[PDB]
Amino acid sequence: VKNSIIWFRKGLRLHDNPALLEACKDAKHVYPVFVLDPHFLQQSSYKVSVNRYNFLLESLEDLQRSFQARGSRLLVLRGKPEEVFPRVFREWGVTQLCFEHDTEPYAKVRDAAVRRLAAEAGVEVVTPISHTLYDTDMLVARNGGAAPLTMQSFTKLVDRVGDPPAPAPDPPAAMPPPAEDMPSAAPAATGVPTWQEVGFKEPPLTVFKGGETEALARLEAAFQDPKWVAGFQKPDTDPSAWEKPATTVLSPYLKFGCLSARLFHARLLEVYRRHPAHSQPPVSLRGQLLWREFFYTVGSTTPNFHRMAGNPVCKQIDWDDNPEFLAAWREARTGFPWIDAIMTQLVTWGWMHHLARHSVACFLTRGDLYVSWERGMEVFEEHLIDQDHYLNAANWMWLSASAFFSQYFRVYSPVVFGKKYDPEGRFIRKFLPVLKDMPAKYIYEPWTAPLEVQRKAGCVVGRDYPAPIVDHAVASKACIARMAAAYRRSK
């Protein structure tokens, strides 16, 4: 008799889930499992806000509903996978364990340990690729055994390899449930908890809801305008747009696997077929999925990718240990409203537009404050709802000119950058209410408002909103000087 586990970690969906499909095939009982793992709650190492963790819980609640609707049940097991799984293998008479492959450092250690244990229990292990467009090992293999290090040569590689696989079909309308009266499957030990019960003190404030149903809705909303999809150009999109964000906001759903990257890609290709002037990579929407694939592919084959030291793709730079600069940045009190509004969005929504992530990451690292990208990445690791190990590392290295990108003379202005999109400062008025009534003339530079104007707007620099912590002209020149010297020490 076939008794199977479908183990969810990412891949939090029923659509495009070949793992799930294999688990159901010829099965008497299927046990859908997510292991609520203490590794992600020990705030010592690994950081997570209530925003992200509650987005996860919402996604698990949506899975529960999808499984309940098909005659089954999601089991949220508490514990370390190494010690939970041997128990349930025996208790449930498990013959097959299915899960979606992942390539992160923790995933590799965890997944090796669970395979060894599975083999000891006589349990078959089935691990299809479906978090990424392609099997990332296959790509490296086809490229002659190393990952390409530019987006251009990565794009050429995948064009030679061909289209990603189709989304797998939808799973059956009825699924075999867990067997009755299994003690590790007791409802009360296996329900989706709340953020309160997991132990978060403060409520989540983000406006984006977790789960596959929300992911599919947001995918559908995006594809209701095929000209927009066809003509999408990432660098030409507006980072100050918040009522209707200028990009898809599909990142947290792709991060958790509430949305299938292959579904998204197949949908793009349908549109591109009927729209022959469609944008091409890297700026196109397909280009965006390829950035993701690119950084996963490089990231999974490089040791210490998420660090500077011991990381072969990363420049060793003499970053300042400057806790007050980092704290001002982290706590949204740099005195540059563009920067502080974005850092407020980070902590409220857990999502900003890519170019707002550029402004704040450039400002922290190579642009003004010369703090290590690792400090920035950690702050993003806590607050981003789309926090992705490889994508966050790679973009921080890109923005600090530590890897992939070397043009350290290009520095974004914390005053001018947003102003060319949003001269009235609508974005700033949203995320920093204290500047609601400041005239647009002064909103990017409130320290240049006459004192009469500051008082009239109820926002006096130094009292209600802080003075700027640097002079951008002085800070950037110094930072460019230090970057030049670090590059010359490297050669």
Ligand X SMILES: O=c1nc2n(C[C@@H](O)[C@H](O)[C@@H](O)CO)c3cc(O)ccc3cc-2c(=O)[nH]1
Residue list for the binding site for FAD: 234, 247-251, 288-295, 351, 354, 357, 386-388, 392, 395
In the annotated binding site, the residues are 234, 247-251, 288-295, 351, 354, 357, 386-388, 392, 395
3, 5, 6, 10: which one contacts ligand X (CB under 6 A)?
10
Q: How far apart are CA 399 and CA 358, in angstroms?
A: 7
The dihedral built from the CA positions of residue 439, 440, 443 and 449, taken in this order, carries a sign that is negative
* Type of residue found at 289: L
- Distance of closest approach, residue 306 Cβ to ligand X, in angstroms: 11
Q: What are the structure tokens assigned to 388, written together?
A: 């992705």
Question: Cα torsion at 213, 216, 217, 223 (round to 10°)?
Answer: 180
Q: Could you say whether residue 361 binds ligand FAD (CB under 6 A)?
A: yes
Cα dist from 125 to 35, 179, 285, whole Å: 17, 21, 35
Q: Could you say whether residue 74 binds ligand X (CB under 6 A)?
A: no
- Distance of closest approach, residue 76 Cβ to Cl ion, in angstroms: 8
Q: What are the structure tokens assigned to 402, written together?
A: 């530590």
String marking each residue 223-252 x if it binds ligand FAD according to CB under 6 A: -----------x------------xxxxx-
Number of residues that bind ligand FAD (CB under 6 A): 28
In Å, how far from its chain's centre is CA 273?
Answer: 29
Q: Which of 117, 111, 96 is nearest to 22 (CA)?
A: 96
Q: What are the structure tokens assigned to 270, written together?
A: 């349908």
Q: Which is nearer to Cl ion, 37 or 388 (CB)?
A: 37
Q: How far apart are CA 19 and CA 101, in angstroms?
A: 9
Q: Could you say whether residue 37 binds ligand X (CB under 6 A)?
A: yes
Candidates 89-97, 201-209, 349-357, 404-412: pick the segment binding ligand FAD (CB under 6 A). Answer: 349-357
Could you say which of Cl ion, ligand X, ligand FAD, none residue 193 binds, taking C-beta under 5 to 8 angstroms by partner kind?
A: Cl ion
Strands (E) located in 107-254: 124-126
Q: Which is nearer to Cl ion, 71 or 199 (CB)?
A: 199
Q: Could you say whether residue 36 binds ligand FAD (CB under 6 A)?
A: no
Q: Which is nearer to ligand FAD, 214 or 386 (CB)?
A: 386
Q: Are strands 96-99 and 3-8 parallel, antiparallel or unpaired?
A: parallel
For residue 15, how many C-alpha atoms fall within 13 Å in the half-sphere facing its CB? 18
Candidates 3-11, 149-157, 382-390, 404-412: pick the segment binding ligand FAD (CB under 6 A). Answer: 382-390
Number of residues that bind Cl ion (CB under 5 A): 1
Q: Which of 155, 342, 366, 105 is nearest to 239 (CA)?
A: 342
- Distance of closest approach, residue 390 Cβ to ligand FAD, in angstroms: 8
- Cβ atoms of 13 and 259 closer than 8 Å: yes
Spatial neighbors of 220 by CB under 8 A, at least 6 apart, are none
Give the residues lining the site for ligand X (CB under 6 A): 9-10, 35-37, 40, 48, 52-53, 56, 102, 104, 106-107, 387
Give the residues lining the site for ligand FAD (CB under 6 A): 234, 247-251, 254-255, 288-289, 291-292, 295, 353-354, 357-358, 361, 380, 384, 386-388, 391-392, 395-396, 399
Give the residues lining the site for Cl ion (CB under 5 A): 193
